[PDB]
Design a protein around this nucleic acid. Structure first.
Length: 884
RNA sequence: GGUCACUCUGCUAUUUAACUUUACGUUGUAGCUCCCUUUCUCGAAAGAGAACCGUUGCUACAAUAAGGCCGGUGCCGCAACGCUCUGCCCCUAGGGGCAUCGUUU
DNA sequence: TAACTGGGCCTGTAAAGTTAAATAGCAGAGTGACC
DNA sequence: AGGCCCAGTTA
């Protein structure tokens, strides 16, 4: 099996591809061999550009929030029962309070003046616990500039200031006189923050109430009840706990199994100091010069004595005035800050055993330990658990009172302890590294294999580029595992593939430019091509990616020569760089498209034999049987995960009387004429005059609902004087998802179809009718297998099972009794008509390059297998797979 | 000497991953409230007055994935990656592919 | 009265913190490989 | 972009 490969691969954000070539003795390729292109599912939400895992993280966060709030209210009700406020006869079967009042603001205001019923008192407590305001929970240090206070902070601070004035005693009293004043309502509406309170003010109201209801003879003012309610109001789970920081740390440079040193460590701060000092060889007298040993020793230990050793103090300590020095800094801005030592010193001088002018002292190892503790942990529990019986209790209490460390450095404490004395002597960082670790300091151990392994867990930041590198490794290994190891493959990352979705939309080498790809390919196995000069080699060209990756591939296969040499020379500051060779300038255009030949309108060479024979008769001995008509390979998605749509709609009629409609309120600002036509009180004829008034108000502005119905400029009023901010509108709901089935009639649109199972049947008039059934994620969660085919009737035993498929799986095409074979790729399916969206070997821009097809009478639709760059086999399945 | 790349430090900008909360929004149920369909009752008429349902606004409460686990204030569940355990599909005992399998947990 | 077909509508959101990591720009120190 | 309905047309 003779083999030779310098093939060449070109990658992009939405596609990768490769084209093979036969090489000779030295750096010269003969005729090409084979090509194949894979496409991508861009790893980001298409329109927004958000990460796919970002929505998952937000869903997890809101799940946790909702669940913890529910359980906090449950604990509140259990405490209400225990402390004797309410008895078991006051709780229903679901644990809720019977006849619980719905006026907690008025009751919170009246509790300042009168006695409260146990029901009123329980309602007030539950209302204070459920709506508890915002907690600052940020670093207590600050300055005299707060410019970025947004809407939430502005509202909270304004309400707090209005509560600190001598007119309103409590937040509920202020809420009642803002309810009446201008808002008309109490809470926030339409994403506003004007009415939110600080949790400190709500805690103050809770304490003051408890005191007042102690004055007025409320029987339930127990200390246990007060402590429980205050704990339920104030307690929050910590943001960082345990190894949360440790699991997020990088790896030390030289020391293999050692964690990074904290930036606020003694050793690390002295290391930064010595780095600055020894690399400060910057004194310009017309020529630079280092600092002598006596100069360094004199200036070194001043940052401990004073607060900040700035450049002015440095000059005033030793130097002159004419050889200005102080390299490439062009005032004197602090030059160094011993922030860890100075911060510990001022914290201990605040309350502890310390004097202001006197210099403080502690074991350098203990300083290291406390820095590491405050960087790796934030809760007092974990910090004490790490520093108990390592430090004294009083100084530990002071440190927990006023110390907080955040950042880290790139090298461990062990390597730092080995390195910093060599810098104290005067040696440079690289000198110490070469002296200690023998100038190697990292062993690639280049286990060059034929197959390329994947990347590790902490691969890179960008998930789009992570997926790019993963599928690039896949496509490279697929060809290396069957065509031998390549000599000078190809490299090709587009300027847009690198990074910057937002800049990508602005455009419609500042990127993660192969820093993990170049290293990976160079170690575990090449030609570094440049997309700018990758269009160059003599040979637009149908920008729509039928084979748009193939040209980039064949030319990334040709970048190893003086072209790149004087390209680097032109990057340094050359006119001609042609490389015409092998007389395939138009043969490649013939092969990669299939039927291009400069004709631009001709039947595709969709057959192997036909393609080879026709190219043999086109512009002789360059024909190689190891080729097949090229078509793109789709990365398929078979994930069974997904979620239903977030919008909740009424479904009382849908389940009780089985009319296929949902009802949802629509704001008058986002309303349209069709919504008015689907008003609940209009289509049943309840409120015709209101409908006519709304229609007139909309038509007066020609459909501009944001301007016709605008608060504070054009409010709408019903007959009688009641405001209308939204109206219930009916929508057609053929299929849905029932939610909260125990306590309500609520539905949500299906969303996230995971797969489609297609059955085929005969016996109407000797013809084949196909029925297609959808399967969504919620059905997989509920473990059900549907039997209704999108418009069709039930699936009985008569219908024989034919197959099932997911997105991007290819199938076969009839389109009629007598037509062409038309292999295509699934994209979507229609829940109403059963239609299919499809795309063929053309890149398939979903906006315009779509194809629509209905499926009831197609006379042939078949499952297919479309593995690597071109390895298409026919797959057949006969056992209907279930869902769990 | 220039070009590129790499290690370390400082500052800046952007991006990514994890976690803690708040305020909304949506649906439902109550209560008060704006309209209003229908059906009745009292009326000899005029006129009143009730009731279900719909529904405007405000307040409260509930739900806010659907669902999996298992030796309670419990862990997961809209993502990515991979072939060590399984299935499917595929290709020649060997090898791939895709997962409903596993990992980040 | 049932399919086919082009058009077109609706889709969950903002704000406040604790962290870690990745890319790029500038300044400072060095290394190595090419031109 | 996914989901899928709407009004017209066609067999």
């Amino acid at each position: 099996n003779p083999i030779n490969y310098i093939l060449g691969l070109a990658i992009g954000i939405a596609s990768v591809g490769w084209a093979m070539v036969e090489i000779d003795e030295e750096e010269n390729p003969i005729r090409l061999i084979d090509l194949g292109v894979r496409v991508f599912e861009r790893a980001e939400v298409p329109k927004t550009g958000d990460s796919l895992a970002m929505a998952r993280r937000l869903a997890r966060s809101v799940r946790r929030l909702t669940r913890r709030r529910a359980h906090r209210l449950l604990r509140a009700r259990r405490l209400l029962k225990r402390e004797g406020v309410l008895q078991a006869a006051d709780f229903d079967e679901n644990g809720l309070i019977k006849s619980l009042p719905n006026t907690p603001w008025q009751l919170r205001a009246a509790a300042l003046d009168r006695k409260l019923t146990p029901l009123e008192w329980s309602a007030v407590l539950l209302h204070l616990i459920k709506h508890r305001g915002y907690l600052s929970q940020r670093k207590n240090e600050g300055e005299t500039a707060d410019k970025e206070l947004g809407a939430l902070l502005k509202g909270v601070a304004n309400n707090a200031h209005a509560l600190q004035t001598g007119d309103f005693r409590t937040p509920a009293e202020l809420a009642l006189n803002k309810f009446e004043k201008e808002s008309g309502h109490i809470r926030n509406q339409r994403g506003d923050y004007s009415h939110t309170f600080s949790r400190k003010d709500l805690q103050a109201e809770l304490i003051l109430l408890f005191e007042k209801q102690k004055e007025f003879g409320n029987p339930h003012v127990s200390g246990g009840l007060k402590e429980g309610i205050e704990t339920l109001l104030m307690t929050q789970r910590p943001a960082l706990s345990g190894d949360a920081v440790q699991k997020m740390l990088g790896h030390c440079t030289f020391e293999p199994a050692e964690p990074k040193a904290a930036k606020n460590t003694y050793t690390a701060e002295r290391f930064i100091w010595l780095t600055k000092l020894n690399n400060l060889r910057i004194l310009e007298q017309g020529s630079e010069r280092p600092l002598t040993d006596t100069e360094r020793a004199t200036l070194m230990d001043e940052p401990y004595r004073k607060s900040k050793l700035t450049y002015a103090q440095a000059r005033k300590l030793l130097g002159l005035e004419d050889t200005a020095f102080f390299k490439g800094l062009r005032e004197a801005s602090t030059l160094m800050e011993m922030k860890a030592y100075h911060a510990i010193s001022r914290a201990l001088e605040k309350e502890g055993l310390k004097d202001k002018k006197s210099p403080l002292n502690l074991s350098s190892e203990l300083q290291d330990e406390i820095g590491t503790a405050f960087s790796l942990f934030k809760t007092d529990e974990d910090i004490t658990g790490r520093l108990k019986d390592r430090v004294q209790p009083e100084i530990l209490e002071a440190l927990l009172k006023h110390i907080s460390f955040d950042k880290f450095v790139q090298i461990s404490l062990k390597a730092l302890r080995r390195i910093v004395p060599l810098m104290e002597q005067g040696k440079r960082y690289d000198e110490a590294c070469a002296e200690i670790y023998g100038d190697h300091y990292g062993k690639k151990n280049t286990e060059e294999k034929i197959y390329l392994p994947p990347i590790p867990a902490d691969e890179i930041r960008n998930p789009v580029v992570l997926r790019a590198l993963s599928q690039a490794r896949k496509v490279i290994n697929g060809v290396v595992r069957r065509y031998g190891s390549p000599a000078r493959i190809h490299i090709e990352t587009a300027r847009e593939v690198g990074k910057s979705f937002k800049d990508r939309k602005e455009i419609e080498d500042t990127r993660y430019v192969n820093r993990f790809l170049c290293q990976f390919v160079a170690d575990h196995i090449v030609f570094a091509s440049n997309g700018q000069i990758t269009n160059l080699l003599r040979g637009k060209v149908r920008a729509e990616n039928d084979r748009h990756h193939a040209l980039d591939a064949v030319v990334v296969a040709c970048s190893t020569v003086a072209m790149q040499q004087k390209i680097t020379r032109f990057v340094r500051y050359k006119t001609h760089f042609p490389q015409p060779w092998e007389f395939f300038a138009q043969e490649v255009m013939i092969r990669v498209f299939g039927k291009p030949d400069g004709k631009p309108e001709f039947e595709e060479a969709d057959t192997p034999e036909k393609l080879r024979t026709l190219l043999a008769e086109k512009l002789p001995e360059a024909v190689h049987e190891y080729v097949t008509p090229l078509f793109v390979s789709r990365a398929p998605n078979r994930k069974m995960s997904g979620a239903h749509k977030d919008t909740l709609r009424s479904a009382k009629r849908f389940v009780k009387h089985n009319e296929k409609i949902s009802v949802k309120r629509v704001w008058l600002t986002e309303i349209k004429l069709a919504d008015l036509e689907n008003m609940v009180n209009y289509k049943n004829g309840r409120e015709i005059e209101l409908y006519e008034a709304l229609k007139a108000r909309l038509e007066a502005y020609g459909g501009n609902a944001k301007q016709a119905f605008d608060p504070k400029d054009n409010p709408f009023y019903k007959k009688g004087g009641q405001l209308v901010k939204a109206v219930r509108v009916e929508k057609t709901q053929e299929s849905g998802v029932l939610l909260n089935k125990k306590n309500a009639y609520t539905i949500a649109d299906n969303g996230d179809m995971v797969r489609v199972d297609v059955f085929c049947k005969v016996d109407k008039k000797g013809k084949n009718q196909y029925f297609i059934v959808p399967i969504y994620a919620w059905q997989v969660a509920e473990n059900i297998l549907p039997d209704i085919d999108c418009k069709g009737y039930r699936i009985d035993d008569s219908y024989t099972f034919c197959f099932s498929l997911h997105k991007y799986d290819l199938i076969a095409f009839q389109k009629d009794e007598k037509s062409k074979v038309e292999f295509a790729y699934y994209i979507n399916c229609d829940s109403s008509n059963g239609r299919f969206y499809l795309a063929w070997h053309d890149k398939g821009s979903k906006e315009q390059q779509f194809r629509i097809s209905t499926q009831n009478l197609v006379l042939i639709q078949k499952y297919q297998v479309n593995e690597l760059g071109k390895e298409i086999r026919p797959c057949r399945l006969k056992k209907r797979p279930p869902v769990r």
